[PDB]
């Protein structure tokens, strides 16, 4: 009634927030998953990195999980907060 049915995508806000919460919960409490975020912490906190740091970070992330899993390159740019996500599933192997 308020939005003239333009707010229909907000009908499941509780369920989507619950699913996000569940995904965060299994994000810290899974083996071969939390150390990837720890590596992200070390990469983000330690700035002024060259390219070779980026490839060794890539294979160090790869070595944590299985050889058949999928990698995702979620690029962030401070200027413009533009998150480009790239599909490199079984590409760097």
């Amino acid at each position: 009634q308020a939005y003239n049915n333009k707010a229909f995508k907000l009908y499941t806000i509780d369920k989507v927030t619950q699913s996000l919460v569940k995904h965060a919960h299994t994000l810290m409490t899974d083996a071969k998953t939390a150390e990837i975020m720890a590596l992200f912490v070390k990469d983000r906190n330690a700035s002024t990195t060259s390219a070779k740091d980026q490839i060794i970070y890539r294979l160090q992330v790869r070595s944590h999980m299985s050889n058949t899993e999928n990698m995702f390159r979620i690029e962030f740019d401070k200027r413009t907060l533009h998150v480009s996500i790239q599909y490199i599933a079984l590409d760097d192997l």
Partner: peptide, 25 residues
């Protein structure tokens, strides 16, 4: 080839962090 004061930051992730970030977006 040192990139000082970097602005583009890369997150490498499996399906779990990707799906979590997709739900956030």
């Amino acid at each position: 080839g040192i990139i000082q004061n970097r602005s583009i930051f890369n997150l490498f992730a499996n399906t779990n962090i990707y799906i979590f970030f997709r739900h956030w977006t």
